[PDB]
Amino acid sequence: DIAGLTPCKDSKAFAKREKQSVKKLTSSLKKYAPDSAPALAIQATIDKTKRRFENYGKFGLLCGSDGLPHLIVSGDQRHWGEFITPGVLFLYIAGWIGWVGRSYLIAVSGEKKPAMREIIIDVELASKIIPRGFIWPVAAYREWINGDLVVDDADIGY
Amino acid sequence: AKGAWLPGLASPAYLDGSLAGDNGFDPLALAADPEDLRWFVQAELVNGRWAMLGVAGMLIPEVLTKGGLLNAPEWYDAGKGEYFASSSTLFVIEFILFHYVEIRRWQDIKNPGSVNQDPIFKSYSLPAHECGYPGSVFNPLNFAPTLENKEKELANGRLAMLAFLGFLVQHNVTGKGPFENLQQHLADPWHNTIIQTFS
Amino acid sequence: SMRDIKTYLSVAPVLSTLWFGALAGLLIEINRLFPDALSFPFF
Amino acid sequence: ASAPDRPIWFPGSTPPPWLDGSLPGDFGFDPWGLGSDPESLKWNVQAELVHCRWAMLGAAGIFIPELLTKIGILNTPSWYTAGEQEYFTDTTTLFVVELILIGWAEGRRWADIIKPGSVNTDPIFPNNKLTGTDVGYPGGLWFDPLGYGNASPEKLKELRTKEIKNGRLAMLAVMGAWFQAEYTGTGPIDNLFAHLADPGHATIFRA
Numbered sequence: 001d002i003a004g005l006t007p008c009k010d011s012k013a014f015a016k017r018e019k020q021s022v023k024k025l026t027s028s029l030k031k032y033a034p035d036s037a038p039a040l041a042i043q044a045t046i047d048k049t050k051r052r053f054e055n056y057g058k059f060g061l062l063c064g065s066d067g068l069p070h071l072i073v074s075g076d077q078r079h080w081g082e083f084i085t086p087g088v089l090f091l092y093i094a095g096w097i098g099w100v101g102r103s104y105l106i107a108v109s110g111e112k113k114p115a116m117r118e119i120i121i122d123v124e125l126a127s128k129i130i131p132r133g134f135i136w137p138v139a140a141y142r143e144w145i146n147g148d149l150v151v152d153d154a155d156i157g158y
Numbered sequence: 159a160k161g162a163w164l165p166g167l168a169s170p171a172y173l174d175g176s177l178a179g180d181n182g183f184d185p186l187a188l189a190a191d192p193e194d195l196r197w198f199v200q201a202e203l204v205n206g207r208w209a210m211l212g213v214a215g216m217l218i219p220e221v222l223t224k225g226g227l228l229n230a231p232e233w234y235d236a237g238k239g240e241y242f243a244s245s246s247t248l249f250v251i252e253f254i255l256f257h258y259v260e261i262r263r264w265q266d267i268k269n270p271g272s273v274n275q276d277p278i279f280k281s282y283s284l285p286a287h288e289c290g291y292p293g294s295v296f297n298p299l300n301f302a303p304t305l306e307n308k309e310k311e312l313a314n315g316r317l318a319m320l321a322f323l324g325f326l327v328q329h330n331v332t333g334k335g336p337f338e339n340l341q342q343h344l345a346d347p348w349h350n351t352i353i354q355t356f357s
Numbered sequence: 358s359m360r361d362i363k364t365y366l367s368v369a370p371v372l373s374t375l376w377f378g379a380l381a382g383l384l385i386e387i388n389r390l391f392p393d394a395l396s397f398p399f400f
Numbered sequence: 401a402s403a404p405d406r407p408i409w410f411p412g413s414t415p416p417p418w419l420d421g422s423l424p425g426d427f428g429f430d431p432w433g434l435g436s437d438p439e440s441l442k443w444n445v446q447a448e449l450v451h452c453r454w455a456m457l458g459a460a461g462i463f464i465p466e467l468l469t470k471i472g473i474l475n476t477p478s479w480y481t482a483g484e485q486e487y488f489t490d491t492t493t494l495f496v497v498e499l500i501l502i503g504w505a506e507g508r509r510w511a512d513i514i515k516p517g518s519v520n521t522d523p524i525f526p527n528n529k530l531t532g533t534d535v536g537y538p539g540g541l542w543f544d545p546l547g548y549g550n551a552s553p554e555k556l557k558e559l560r561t562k563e564i565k566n567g568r569l570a571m572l573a574v575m576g577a578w579f580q581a582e583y584t585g586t587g588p589i590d591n592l593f594a595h596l597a598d599p600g601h602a603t604i605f606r607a
């Protein structure tokens with residue numbers, strides 16, 4: 001397939017690795033009583049391992065000659081679940097955090113001693129600003145349009 | 159008149175009640191800036207009218223065919239049908255026809271009265287009006303633009319937007335169309351809800 | 358007093374401790390419900 | 401309505417300066433100072449008045465069915481397991497309906513605490529309304545059909561104190577029933593008969 005890689009659901013090395021891990025777990029499982037707690041924990045680990053391999057196989061990942069999954073990040077539409085969609089989620093969350101921080105700093109700077117409100121948080125004020133990160137992409141865009149996001153170079157100084 | 163979306167809450171200072179549909183609802187302070195308010199006022203009307211049209215033309219054919227007087231596919235399959243022209247041609251026609259009308263609408267938002275003139279026949283124009291509510295040709299029967307009618311339009315548009323969101327979400331979990339989902343709820347009301355859908 | 362204890366509970370290290378504890382709990386529970394994820398498979 | 405010469409929870413002790421025997425049921429008990437600031441005092445009063453009525457409703461519906469079953473008039477099952485049985489619909493589908501219906505009333509009550517007197521009128525028919533005049537004590541044909549809530553400020557305080565004390569008792573009774581069911585392993589009414597049969601050995605130390 002892409003870059004000489006093979007789908008993990010059809011890779012012999014992938015199945016070999018799964019079998020080796022399951023055998024290694026079963027060798028430890030064969031040391032305890034069937035109804036003891038360690039046996040149940042090892043059995044749960046075995047079931048989890050089988051589920052992990054099955055999900056990797058059926059989610060469309062690609063495997064190399066080593067028998068391990070590899071990620072594709074060039075933009076191909078068959079692999080957006082690997083980088084692009086989680087990346088959009090990361091950007092959304094990070095923008096929320098940054099936007100609420102900047103809005104708190106701007107709202108608090110008008111007081112007599114703003115620094116006192118930076119080592120002791122005003123939770124009453126922050127609890128009104130936290131929910132507003134929900135629409136940060138709209139607010140930031142509108143603020144950029146109207147020229148409220150950036151300070152002119154002439155005005156920057158201590 | 160100006161009501162309250164939440165009985166017992168104070169209204170924002172910038173929502174004094176000079177706009178149709180004012181109910182003091184802006185918890186996240188999107189419209190604190192006066193210009194943002196105008197932009198959102200226009201966007202509300204546009205997204206709402208499109209949603210109303212979409213819901214009507216998305217629901218009526220289904221019930222018409224289910225009655226038995228027509229044989230048409232569901233709304234989520236009509237894009238995969240046989241038409242006299244391919245989908246690409248229709249998209250290109252749509253894009254070309256819409257760039258013109260949308261920039262024409264944009265130029266009036268930027269400065270009212272700028273694009274009232276007819277380009278070809280230099281004898282027709284639009285009399286003075288308010289942005290979002292033109293008249294003349296766009297009002298053939300020449301109804302009365304009273305405050306009551308604007309509120310009646312806004313209420314149905316706001317309802318239609320939620321209806322379209324509901325259709326979109328209900329298709330991605332059930333996959334059987336709106337009317338089938340309604341009849342399933344009406345068959346066993348206590349055993350057919352969203353809870354049974356996920357379990 | 359209640360005013361003073363509410364003021365002390367709002368100091369930076371205490372609030373950081375509480376916030377990070379809650380976030381860690383949320384992430385641990387999510388990883389217990391949807392374990393061993395390398396991609397986003399829903400859509 | 402200050403009344404320093406009133407019984408307290410601990411004779412010989414000084415009552416806190418923020419309690420002066422105005423509210424019904426006041427006995428000068430607040431060791432941890434959770435109501436020193438007057439703003440939170442109203443919130444605490446409302447919370448107690450709500451917990452009390454919930455506990456009273458729970459207690460009145462948790463012992464009488466058990467007593468009737470013990471006598472044999474009714475055949476209701478154990479209260480401690482009735483949540484895990486099967487009913488006409490799914491148990492999860494009842495919780496959401498409960499949430500919606502109770503949330504309407506909870507928000508309607510919440511609006512009155514912040515803005516008193518702002519939710520006293522029926523939203524549909526603007527003629528019918530409630531005659532209550534104090535926060536937490538509404539009044540009308542819906543909540544006071546007999547008309548016992550209108551009296552001089554002598555019987556009103558005594559009735560409120562009666563309600564507060566009958567609710568404070570039930571608040572402890574419900575938790576006691578829960579702990580007994582979890583620890584003893586049988587019904588609550590059976591525990592009373594066990595204690596009245598051998599009142600020297602049938603106690604908590606028996607297990």
Ligand code: CLA
Pocket residue numbers: 097098099100101102104121126
């Ligand atoms: C309000 C928070 C905030 C915001 C919006 C920014 C924004 C920015 N920072 Mg700054 N920064 C912050 C806090 C913040 N910083 C803090 C607390 C530190 C001390 C560690 C730094 C240290 C720092 C460095 C060393 C650099 C930047 C840089 C940058 C720029 C690029 C982004 C970057 O590299 O970030 C990287 C920054 C971090 C990983 C630091 C952690 C940021 C935290 C998580 C922010 C939120 C914490 C805060 C307590 C939340 C309060 C919430 C409120 C409701 C009470 C950008 C202008 C870079 C720059 O100059 O680019 C041109 C750069 O080199 N920042």
Ligand code: CLA
Pocket residue numbers: 320321323324325327328331332339340342343350351352353355
């Ligand atoms: C506002 C219009 C509206 C109406 C009348 C319905 C009606 C229905 N929906 Mg739908 N739904 C809506 C909006 C609506 N939905 C929206 C906005 C969403 C996205 C969150 C969904 C998501 C959804 C799912 C995922 C499912 C349904 C299902 C159902 C059916 C069973 C009831 C149920 O479980 O609801 C569940 C309700 C919700 C998830 C949220 C509803 C939120 C709306 C805005 C409340 C409207 C309140 C308003 C006062 C009601 C007016 C009633 C009437 C006068 C129009 C029922 C026919 C189920 C089905 O298909 O059963 C066969 C089902 O599985 N709906």
Ligand code: CLA
Pocket residue numbers: 387388391392393394395
């Ligand atoms: C930059 C470094 C980096 C990166 C990119 C990763 C990435 C990853 N690590 Mg690794 N890791 C790292 C460093 C890193 N790690 C380090 C330094 C250590 C040592 C301390 C580890 C130790 C480690 C372990 C032990 C494990 C991982 C695992 C993982 C995976 C976690 C996936 C997950 O939990 O998804 C699920 C989580 C989420 C989706 C996050 C959701 C966040 C919130 C709740 C979103 C809310 C959105 C909200 C609803 C709004 C949207 C809706 C909108 C409509 C408003 C992922 C591939 C785990 C794994 O499975 O690997 C294969 C795993 O077991 N890592």
Ligand code: CLA
Pocket residue numbers: 572573575576577579580583584590591592594595602603604605
């Ligand atoms: C007012 C409520 C109340 C009442 C009347 C009773 C009564 C009884 N309980 Mg119960 N109990 C209660 C509250 C109550 N309990 C509470 C709050 C708890 C949790 C701490 C428990 C935990 C509990 C256990 C674990 C056991 C009992 C048991 C018993 C029985 C034997 C006495 C005993 O060992 O007490 C032990 C007492 C306690 C562990 C603490 C009691 C604390 C409350 C506040 C005392 C209130 C006294 C009250 C003011 C006196 C006047 C009442 C008035 C109506 C006249 C008896 C029928 C035993 C049983 O089942 O015997 C068959 C038993 O095993 N109770």
Ligand SMILES: CC(/C=C/C=C(C)/C=C/[C@@]12O[C@]1(C)C[C@@H](O)CC2(C)C)=C\C=C\C=C(C)\C=C\C=C(C)\C=C\[C@@]12O[C@]1(C)C[C@@H](O)CC2(C)C
Pocket residue numbers: 429430431432433434451454455457458459461462479482483571572574575
């Ligand atoms: C114990 C309790 C609260 C106790 C509080 C205490 C001691 C506080 C003490 C102090 O703060 C003071 C005053 C002053 C401070 O200075 C000092 C301290 C010491 C800090 C609440 C219980 C509160 C208990 C409540 C609300 C219980 C509700 C129960 C219900 C509704 C039950 C319903 C059902 O039983 C039915 C009817 C039928 C069944 O089939 C189904 C179910 C659901 C089981």
Ligand SMILES: CC1=C(/C=C/C(C)=C/C=C/C(C)=C/C=C/C=C(C)/C=C/C=C(C)/C=C/[C@@]23O[C@]2(C)C[C@@H](O)CC3(C)C)C(C)(C)C[C@H](O)C1
Pocket residue numbers: 135183184185186187188205206208209211212213215216233234236237319320322323
């Ligand atoms: C207002 C407000 C807020 C809330 C905002 C909210 C909830 C906004 C919600 C907005 C929504 C749902 C908008 C939805 C718009 C939907 C639109 C335009 C839908 C259009 C649909 C069309 C053209 C459909 C075409 C078709 O179907 C047909 C016809 C026939 C089919 O064959 C083909 C397709 C294409 C499917 C907060 C953010 C919460 C706080 C703030 O402070 C105040």
Ligand SMILES: CCCCCCCCCCCCO[C@H]1O[C@H](CO)[C@@H](O[C@H]2O[C@H](CO)[C@@H](O)[C@H](O)[C@H]2O)[C@H](O)[C@H]1O
Pocket residue numbers: 144145146147148150151152
């Ligand atoms: C694929 C994506 C394509 C995107 C294409 C569209 C890009 C649109 C860019 C809009 C830029 C808006 O911001 C840009 O103009 C603002 C003025 O309007 C500038 O704002 C500046 O001038 C304003 C007056 O006009 C002052 O009030 C501001 O204090 C000053 O910063 C911003 O410093 C500049 O960055």
